[PDB]
Write a protein that binds this ligand. Structure first.
Ligand SMILES: CCCCCCCCCCCCCCCCCC(=O)OC[C@H](CO[C@@H]1O[C@H](CO[C@H]2O[C@H](CO)[C@H](O)[C@H](O)[C@H]2O)[C@H](O)[C@H](O)[C@H]1O)OC(=O)CCCCCCCCCCCCCCCCC
Ligand SMILES: CCCCCCCCCCCCCCCCCC(=O)OC[C@H](CO[C@@H]1O[C@H](CO[C@H]2O[C@H](CO)[C@H](O)[C@H](O)[C@H]2O)[C@H](O)[C@H](O)[C@H]1O)OC(=O)CCCCCCCCCCCCCCCCC
Ligand code: CLA
Ligand code: CLA
Ligand code: CLA
Ligand code: CLA
Ligand code: CLA
Ligand SMILES: CCCCCCCCCCCCCCCC(=O)OC[C@H](COP(=O)(O)OC[C@@H](O)CO)OC(=O)CCCCCCCCCCCCCCC
Ligand SMILES: CC1=CCCC(C)(C)[C@H]1/C=C/C(C)=C/C=C/C(C)=C/C=C/C=C(C)/C=C/C=C(C)/C=C/C1=C(C)CCCC1(C)C
Ligand SMILES: CC1=CCCC(C)(C)[C@H]1/C=C/C(C)=C/C=C/C(C)=C/C=C/C=C(C)/C=C/C=C(C)/C=C/C1=C(C)CCCC1(C)C
Ligand SMILES: CC1=CCCC(C)(C)[C@H]1/C=C/C(C)=C/C=C/C(C)=C/C=C/C=C(C)/C=C/C=C(C)/C=C/C1=C(C)CCCC1(C)C
Ligand SMILES: [Cl-]
Ligand SMILES: [Cl-]
Ligand SMILES: [Fe+2]
Ligand SMILES: [Mn+2]
Ligand SMILES: [Mn+2]
Lengths: 327, 32, 45, 30, 341, 36, 434, 37, 64, 35
């Protein structure tokens, strides 16, 4: 109001917009939109990329014989490594497309966009006067994305080791990672699996307990969801009934009588799990691999008695030889 | 007192639990 | 080298644009009361 | 020809997202 | 009253651990399943079924100890202790993998008993039984993976063995022999599980960050009491935040909690459908068009073809030790390798 | 008559006399004893 | 009382939050934590010197502080060999003994010392909102840090010198006679690209640049400390920052998070401030050393399918870089940016010169290449570089998380809704819908 | 290896570096002593 | 409580210890000892081949 | 390629400057509890 810059600041940080922009959104929206359109264009019509750097390109585009499942944005060429590879650092646009430059473009703009999304979540929480730790929760998927897209290529020394922007490419990344590092035996991936399984279990349990104890505010001819009115001041379900049911399903001591503590635990468990699995990916990027229980049992004569870890190692070896096209 | 559901369930958990703990502790000192 | 600046013309956006916006910011900064407040943050705006 | 179907499905999903965002039922206090 | 009424009164008494009528099925079956798993992972070997050591007595740790599946020589036998395979001999019954069948059967009946327990406690408390319908997800997972899949296969041998490294081996074996990641039902299951974790985290953070200031203490856990007629967090503020941040937001708490219930359940049921499909080797292993394109064009390569090659590597380099009953002997020349492809 | 069928009959008898009868008898005795 | 949730509003698991508004106990807590850090340093140094096997190298024994002491020049001779471990023992003893004094100071200022300082010692008290006093404390500690950097400089140039891997014929303890004081080099290092081939500040490859940069850092820190002591924050700075203890904590948290990421990258990539005779070779160094050893064993003899120039265009294990230079071929092509002391004499203007490798090669270079090939961080043993990099990368990430948490809570507490929504004047109820 | 005079004090030194962890535990013990007030 | 549990619990722990140390676990559960994984005649992995002769086959395999 | 580089540099510098000077414009005062 006072000045032109003040009016611009008021519009940027305005809560009257359909989507809040904010200063973090000033960086988030251009980067995210650029990465989105480049990803769409590459997924539709990108030329094949020589990912391994030995002049045998790999196709990942729809126009080159891929479906939705098999389509991907191929990571950058192994000859590029982790060198910064924008469009202007390539001799020609064909050379830039041939070496997987759009992968670097999408990855960098997407990481900037998700950082801006974290900041924008904090910014709108501050604008609305609420508590700011939703962004702390969102840091975990951002950490996982940065570990699979940036940290692992940095540790390995090439963006070709990053996760391809696709479905079958993602599966290939998982299989090659398991072969190279034995992530299944890594305790941090085990913590991440526990986190996601517990998140599913706790989401289902919380939904079941709230839906089970819904206070009757509706008739049989309509959905029970209409028993809750948006903006109502009363609670839509009986906390006491759900607590009693849960404390009778298991022993009485195991129950979350405090709703705030229950929701804090609901927020905490999967976020901590994803944090741990992202940290595990980051550590294995620098070759801090998982547990090795191979040849852990031998007889008196010294012959190795195989365990399930030996079978897992056999599968990892079978994947390893196929992944390495060289000796 | 002598017999209660809680008592029987606790001992059904504990009498094998202590037996298995003793067995595993013995396994720890095997020549292997 | 430097800020990826291998051509001198690249320095034109890197200086003129931050200055120009700053000039706009100056019109904001001169409007605000710039005295001490002794608080966690300044509510005067 | 299947690429046309794939692109059509993706664009339709994106348009459904756009209409769900910008043409939702406006929440109100009852 | 009658004897049945008195037994019903006693089973329904408010004790520390609720028993109920469903307890008569749940407690013995679950207790026996857990005890048998501990016994197998502590003492019972897998040397005569898989050619593996899986027990603490043999030197295994928590990760590598497992209750391994029965030998492939047994078909889909119930492997009763008194059955013709064991004929009452406990040692031979343990050596042939009968303890796995013991654990699996008594555990399936324990899951049934726990589902009935949820139904009974919901009926007695006086609430809707949306538990034991959520638990139908895990029940379907167990039935499809540990029962239906081996029944569709040659024997119980190809079921998952009850162990950590055994489960990891099962994952890699299914990936190699079925390409289960490519299965769309497994994709829906992964989407359901990840979305359920997302919903749990986002709902917890949203509730914790939209609480009303109902206390003077900086730590806000004390500000809530169970006997509250008022909501502890602002639904309007949360709806505004997520509608202007994400573009869409929940406005009905009941719909939000039903959705948080529905996503993992739907994911688990879709994954169960996929595993049932795998049980008969009816797998979405390959795309015919991509295989035909790769056959007539050696310069055509996608990540799907690389996945096919990786699955071939798992199958050939694990078949010999993962299926010792088949007596697979593969020379080094026939083993696929990245070099000389 | 085969050993398998003898084993099946003995299994039915064992399930009756070791699982069903003891648990049912204990349940009835405790239920009738504790009328509360 | 001030030591319970009833009088403070903070639970036991957030109990140190009760130390925000009491100065003496906060100072005691910080001094006690400093004593803990010094105690760990001394104890771990004694532990490492107690487990040091003379025949094995430092990086094969899981040691991380002894390489730090060896880089400073203590107890190391030519070629990175360790002569005596007595100076390391002295360092550990001095740290573990000063830890007792620091711990006593922390215990005194925490338990029996005054809770608040301004009522009894006005020169040390503060309010977290008096910007001048906080800037004065910042300036004093800035002067301390600058003097520490100048102490490192004095060690580099006067007292013994520093170990240099780039000395001819292997590394040696050298006095840094002429550090690089030219501002252009330092600014180019600070403004360099962080991506592959440039490396930003991690790519400093000589000791003279390190000593000159530390000279600049020390003098700049002294000047900035005197500045912040003698000045007050300007109008643009006052209106931009939150002025509270938690806000300053969050600023320090993000700073140390960035520092932890930088240190992890330094340990992973840099072989000048982290010599490979002490920390082991880097992953690129190990891969290039394996390739170079194979190249040498092809040049000599020649039965490994390479006896003449017939294979490829150049010799075996050779190819051309994306910019046209001659590099080692194979899977190690991604590591062509590596610069190592044992391979620099064999590299010319166009890259690796085949005839120079044939003739101007030295036995110590071959020994270094073989011993680095044996111990590979990526593979061919858990490298100490791997431990340092993983640990400090994890620490940087978790401290970024802590910065986000504490900055958000500082903003909420300054604004005044960190305890929840008021429920009497709800902000979203005043805003119009949509 | 430690110097000759200090060799016999190898065990306590081996216990030394893990002392700070106990300090953390000690804090919890103190919070356990006062009833987590 | 502690009076009964100061006798029953240690005795049970010692019984569990002796169940392994005396070799009774191997006999009861059929787990091979470290010196009897491969016999002189059978140096291969022993595997059951028929379900209805499994008891006799295991008796033949474990006889040595 | 130089024109694309100068356009990208212009755009990035503009957006970064907008971000920096927007968070310098007393952002803490833009809260509903400010009076
Ligand atoms: C949710 C609700 C339930 C909750 C969980 C409940 C858990 C408790 C029950 C779990 C276990 C049930 C018993 C399964 C035993 C079985 O299956 O026993 C299997 C037997 C058949 O045995 C198999 O029979 C096969 C065919 O043999 C036949 O053909 C052969 C050809 O060479 C030979 O000629 C041979 O002599 C001849 O008998 C092979 O021989 C196999 O080796 C042999 O194991 O069927 C039979 O007993 C009976 C067959 C009738 C069907 C009853 C089971 C139906 C379930 C699905 C079955 C799989 C279908 C595909 C699923 C995908
Ligand atoms: C900001 C942008 C972040 C990404 C930029 C690239 C990060 C990177 O690739 O960093 C690597 C660089 C080092 O780069 C390397 O630097 C090396 C320097 O070594 C050279 O110089 C050495 C001197 O001894 C040796 O001589 C060596 O042989 C020689 O090659 C080489 O140049 C390599 O090619 C080059 O890749 O570290 C640095 O510059 C310091 C920057 C550290 C960034 C840490 C990662 C970013 C944060 C991720 C957070 C994720 C979790 C939170 C999510 C929310
Ligand atoms: C809730 C209780 C319960 C349930 C549902 C089961 C169910 C089962 N058990 Mg388990 N079991 C239980 C309690 C239970 N058990 C207890 C308490 C013990 C300890 C003694 C055992 C010990 C045990 C062993 C050792 C074994 C089983 C096995 C089995 C399976 C085969 C049953 C069978 O054919 O037996 C046949 C007998 C009956 C079904 C009894 C029925 C009696 C009828 C209904 C009464 C009428 C008799 C008639 C008039 C004459 C089945 C899944 C076997 C198995 O599958 O393992 C692989 C096996 O080997 N159980
Ligand atoms: C290294 C980390 C660290 C440090 C430096 C401190 C320091 C402090 N805390 Mg914090 N705290 C910590 C971790 C830490 N705490 C953790 C992890 C928790 C969670 C369990 C807490 C929970 C907590 C609460 C809940 C409170 C504090 C409080 C305090 C202060 C006084 C404590 C008191 O009354 O002691 C009393 C303790 C004793 C009398 C027993 C310990 C005696 C000494 C200290 C043992 C030291 C041993 C050492 C070897 C002695 C060396 C002797 C020397 C001559 C060499 C003090 C500044 C309190 C405070 O001042 O708030 C206003 C408070 O209310 N803290
Ligand atoms: C670096 C952190 C730090 C800080 C800011 C302080 C600050 C202070 N201390 Mg503490 N102290 C510290 C570390 C610290 N101390 C350590 C590490 C020890 C252990 C040796 C002590 C032991 C200690 C004692 C025993 C006493 C103080 C006292 C004081 C006060 C007066 C000191 C003075 O005038 O300087 C003196 C300046 C000199 C140049 C003297 C040279 C020596 C002041 C508030 C005194 C007090 O009453 O305040 C609580 C007091 O009696 N301090
Ligand atoms: C730990 C050290 C420390 C700390 C906490 C502070 C803190 C502060 N200083 Mg002081 N200062 C310091 C050291 C420190 N200073 C030193 C060593 C110097 C000497 C150069 C100064 C000189 C100085 C002056 C002259 C002024 C301040 C001011 C300020 C205030 C605002 C600073 C600001 O907004 O940053 C703004 C930050 C930037 C604009 C970024 C500049 C980055 C440059 C271009 C280098 C970029 C490097 C690289 C490419 C990007 C970062 C990479 C990263 C990973 C390292 C604040 C109280 C101001 C104030 O209000 O006080 C009166 C002020 O006018 N400081
Ligand atoms: C220099 C760094 C620093 C400093 C001074 C503080 C200071 C503070 N923080 Mg912050 N914080 C930091 C870093 C820091 N934090 C980082 C890096 C994170 C991210 C993990 C956090 C996350 C964080 C949260 C989420 C919260 C705080 C809170 C607090 C306050 C109370 C802390 C307390 O009582 O601890 C009590 C100490 C404990 C309960 C002990 C925790 C032990 C951890 C979980 C074990 C971790 C593994 C361990 C190191 C390994 C040892 C093994 C052993 C167990 C055997 C205080 C103002 C709290 C507060 O009141 O906000 C103002 C709060 O809610 N902080
Ligand atoms: C990408 C873009 C990066 C831009 C980096 C911005 C850093 C902060 C610039 C605010 C600069 C800004 O516009 O604020 C200027 C600020 C307010 O300006 P007024 O319009 O009130 O003018 C008062 C006069 O004293 C002129 O400043 O003046 C002061 O606080 C006192 C003098 C300090 C002058 C600045 C010294 C330090 C500047 C560091 C550069
Ligand atoms: C240190 C450590 C680290 C992490 C945290 C931690 C996990 C808490 C901790 C672990 C501690 C540990 C190591 C905890 C371990 C605790 C253990 C080993 C508990 C074992 C319980 C054994 C049972 C219930 C077996 C009962 C046997 C039965 C029912 C027999 C059944 C029979 C079979 C065979 C079949 C036929 C029928 C009959 C005859 C009925
Ligand atoms: C404040 C606070 C409140 C409550 C919470 C809290 C965390 C519990 C508490 C913190 C308290 C804290 C953190 C208190 C801090 C306590 C500290 C760090 C105490 C340090 C003690 C070190 C000693 C005595 C070593 C002396 C070394 C010697 C003699 C070396 C000898 C050597 C010689 C000479 C020659 C070689 C041999 C050897 C023997 C090796
Ligand atoms: C203003 C503003 C904007 C909007 C947001 C806001 C929060 C309100 C605020 C943010 C402000 C922020 C985010 C401010 C933060 C600004 C930062 C992170 C400034 C970094 C400064 C680091 C320098 C100059 C490194 C010097 C290193 C040297 C000389 C190394 C030498 C070396 C040595 C020693 C060793 C050898 C190698 C070499 C390389 C030679
Ligand atoms: Cl592959
Ligand atoms: Cl190679
Ligand atoms: Fe909820
Ligand atoms: Mn790799
Ligand atoms: Mn590989």
């Amino acid at each position: 109001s006072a000045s032109l810059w003040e009016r611009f600041c008021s519009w940027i940080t305005s809560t009257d917009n359909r989507l809040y922009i904010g200063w973090f959104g000033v960086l988030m929206i251009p980067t995210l939109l650029t990465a989105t359109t480049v990803y769409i264009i590459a997924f539709i019509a990108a030329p094949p990329v020589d990912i391994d750097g030995i002049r045998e390109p790999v196709a990942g585009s729809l126009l080159y014989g891929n479906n939705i499942i098999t389509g991907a944005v191929i990571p950058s060429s192994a000859s590029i490594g982790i060198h910064f590879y924008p469009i202007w650092e390539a001799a020609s646009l064909d050379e830039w497309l041939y070496n997987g430059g759009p992968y670097q473009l999408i990855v960098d703009h997407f990481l900037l966009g998700v950082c801006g999304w974290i900041g924008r979540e904090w910014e709108f929480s501050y604008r609305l006067g609420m508590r700011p730790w939703i962004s702390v929760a969102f840091t975990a998927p951002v950490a996982a994305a940065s570990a699979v897209f940036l940290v692992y290529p940095i540790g390995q020394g090439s963006f070709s080791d990053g996760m391809p922007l696709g479905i079958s490419g993602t599966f290939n990344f998982m299989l090659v990672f398991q072969a190279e590092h034995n992530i299944l035996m890594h305790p941090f991936h085990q913590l991440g699996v526990a986190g996601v399984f517990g998140g599913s279990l706790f989401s289902a349990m919380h939904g079941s307990l709230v839906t089970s104890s819904l206070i009757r505010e509706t008739t049989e001819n309509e959905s029970a969801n209409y028993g809750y009115k948006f903006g109502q001041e009363e609670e839509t379900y009986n906390i006491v009934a759900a607590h009693g049911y849960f404390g009778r399903l298991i022993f009485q001591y195991a129950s979350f009588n405090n709703s705030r503590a229950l929701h804090f635990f609901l927020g905490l468990w999967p976020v901590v799990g994803i944090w741990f699995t992202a940290l595990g990916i980051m550590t294995m990027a620098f070759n801090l691999n998982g547990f090795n229980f191979n040849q852990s049992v031998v007889d008196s004569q010294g012959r190795v008695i195989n365990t399930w870890a030996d079978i897992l190692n056999r599968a990892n070896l079978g994947m390893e030889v196929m992944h390495e096209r060289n000796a | 007192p002598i017999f209660t559901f809680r008592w029987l369930a606790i001992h059904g958990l504990a009498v094998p639990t202590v037996f298995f703990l003793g067995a595993i502790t013995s396994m720890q000192f095997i020549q292997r | 080298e430097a800020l990826g600046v291998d051509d001198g013309r690249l320095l034109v956006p890197l200086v003129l644009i931050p200055v120009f916006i700053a000039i706009l910011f100056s019109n904001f900064a001169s409007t605000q009361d710039n005295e001490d407040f002794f608080d966690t943050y300044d509510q005067r705006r | 020809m299947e690429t046309l179907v794939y692109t059509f499905l993706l664009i339709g999903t994106l348009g459904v997202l756009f209409f769900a965002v910008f043409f939702r039922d406006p929440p109100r206090i009852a | 009253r009658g004897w049945f009424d008195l037994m019903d009164d006693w089973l329904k008494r408010d004790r520390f651990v609720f028993v109920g009528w469903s307890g008569l099925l749940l407690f013995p079956t679950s207790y026996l399943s857990i005890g048998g798993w501990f016994t197998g992972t502590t003492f019972v070997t897998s040397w005569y079924t898989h050619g593996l050591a899986s027990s603490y007595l043999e030197g295994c740790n928590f990760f590598t100890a497992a209750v391994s599946t029965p030998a492939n020589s047994m078909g889909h036998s119930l492997l009763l202790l008194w059955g013709p395979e064991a004929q009452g001999d406990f040692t031979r019954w343990c050596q042939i993998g009968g303890l796995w069948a013991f654990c699996a059967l008594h555990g399936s009946f324990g899951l049934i008993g726990f589902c009935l327990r949820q139904f009974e406690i919901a009926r007695l408390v006086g609430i809707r039984p949306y538990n034991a319908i959520a638990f139908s997800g895990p029940i379907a997972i167990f039935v499809s993976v540990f029962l239906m899949y081996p029944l569709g296969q040659a024997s119980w041998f190809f079921a998952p063995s009850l162990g950590v490294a055994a489960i990891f081996r099962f994952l890699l074996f299914i990936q190699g022999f079925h390409n289960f990641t490519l299965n769309p039902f497994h994709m829906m299951g992964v989407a359901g599980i990840l979305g359920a974790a997302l919903l749990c985290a986002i709902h917890g953070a949203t509730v914790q960050n939209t609480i009303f200031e109902d206390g003077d203490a900086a730590n806000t856990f004390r500000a809530f009491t169970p006997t509250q007629a008022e909501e502890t967090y602002s639904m309007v503020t949360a709806n505004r935040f997520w509608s202007q941040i994400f573009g869409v937001a929940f406005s009905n708490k009941r719909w939000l909690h039903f959705f948080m219930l529905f996503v993992p359940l739907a994911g688990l049921w879709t994954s169960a459908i996929g595993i049932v499909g795998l049980a008969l080797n009816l797998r979405a292993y390959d795309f015919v068009s991509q295989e035909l394109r790769a056959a007539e064009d050696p310069e055509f390569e996608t990540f799907y073809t690389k996945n096919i090659l990786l699955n071939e590597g798992i199958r050939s380099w694990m078949a010999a030790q993962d299926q010792p009953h088949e007596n697979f002997i593969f020379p080094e020349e026939v083993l696929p390798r990245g070099n000389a492809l | 008559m085969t050993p398998s069928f003898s084993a099946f009959i003995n299994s039915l008898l064992a399930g009756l006399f070791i699982v069903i009868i003891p648990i049912g008898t204990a349940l009835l005795i405790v239920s009738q004893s504790d009328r509360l | 009382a001030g030591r319970d949730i009833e009088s403070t509003g903070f639970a036991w698991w957030s109990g140190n939050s009760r130390l925000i508004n009491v100065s003496g106990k906060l100072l005691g807590a910080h001094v006690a934590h400093a004593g803990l850090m010094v105690f760990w340093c001394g104890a771990m140094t004694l532990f490492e010197v107690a487990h040091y096997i003379p025949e094995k190298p430092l990086y094969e024994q899981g040691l991380i502080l002894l390489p730090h002491l060896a880089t400073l020049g203590w107890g190391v001779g030519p070629g990175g060999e360790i002569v005596d471990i007595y100076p390391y023992f002295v360092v550990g003893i001095l740290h573990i003994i000063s830890s007792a004094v620091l711990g006593f100071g922390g215990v005194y200022h925490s338990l029996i010392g005054p809770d608040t300082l301004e009522e009894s010692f006005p020169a040390f008290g503060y309010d977290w909102r008096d910007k001048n006093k906080i800037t004065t404390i910042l300036g004093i500690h800035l002067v301390i840090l600058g003097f520490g950097a100048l102490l490192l400089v004095v060690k580099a140039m006067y007292v013994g010198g520093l170990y240099d891997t780039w000395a001819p014929g292997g590394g040696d303890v050298r006095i840094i006679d002429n550090p690089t004081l030219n501002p252009v080099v330092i600014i180019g290092y600070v403004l360099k690209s962080p991506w592959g081939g440039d490396g930003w500040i991690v790519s400093v490859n000589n000791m003279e640049d390190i000593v000159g940069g530390h000279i600049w850092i020390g003098f700049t820190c002294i000047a900035g400390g005197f500045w912040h002591i003698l000045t007050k924050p300007f109008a643009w700075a006052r209106r931009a920052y939150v002025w509270s203890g938690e806000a300053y904590l969050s600023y320090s948290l993000v700073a140390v998070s960035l520092m932890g990421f930088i240190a992890s990258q330094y340990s992973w990539y840099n072989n000048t401030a982290y010599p490979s005779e002490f920390y082991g070779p880097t992953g690129p160094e190990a891969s290039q050393s394996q390739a170079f050893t194979f190249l040498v064993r092809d040049q000599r003899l020649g039965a490994s399918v390479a006896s003449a120039q017939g294979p490829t265009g150049l010799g075996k294990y050779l190819m051309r870089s994306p910019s046209g230079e001659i590099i080692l071929g194979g899977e190690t092509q991604r590591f062509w940016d590596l610069r190592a002391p044992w391979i620099e004499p064999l590299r010319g203007p166009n890259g690796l010169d085949l005839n120079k490798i044939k003739n101007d090669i030295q036995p110590w270079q071959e020994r270094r290449a073989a011993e680095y090939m044996t111990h590979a961080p990526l593979g061919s043993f858990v490298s100490p570089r791997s431990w340092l990099t993983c640990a400090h990368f994890l620490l940087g990430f978790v401290f970024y998380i802590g910065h986000l948490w504490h900055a958000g809570r500082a903003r909420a507490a300054a604004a005044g809704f960190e305890k929840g929504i008021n429920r009497e004047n709800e902000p979203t109820l005043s805003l119009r819908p949509i | 290896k430690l110097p000759e005079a200090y060799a016999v004090f190898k065990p306590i030194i081996d216990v030394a570096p893990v002392i700070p962890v106990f300090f953390l535990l000690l804090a919890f013990v103190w919070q356990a002593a006062v009833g987590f007030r | 409580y502690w009076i009964i549990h100061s006798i029953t619990i240690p005795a049970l722990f010692v019984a569990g210890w002796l169940f392994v140390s005396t070799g009774l676990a191997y006999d009861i559960f059929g787990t091979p000892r470290p010196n009897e994984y491969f016999t002189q005649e059978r140096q291969q992995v022993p595997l059951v081949n028929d379900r209805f002769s499994a008891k006799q086959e295991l008796e033949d395999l474990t006889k040595g | 390629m130089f024109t694309l580089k100068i356009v990208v540099y212009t755009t990035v510098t503009l957006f970064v400057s907008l971000f920096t000077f927007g968070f310098l414009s007393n952002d803490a005062s833009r809260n509903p509890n400010r009076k």
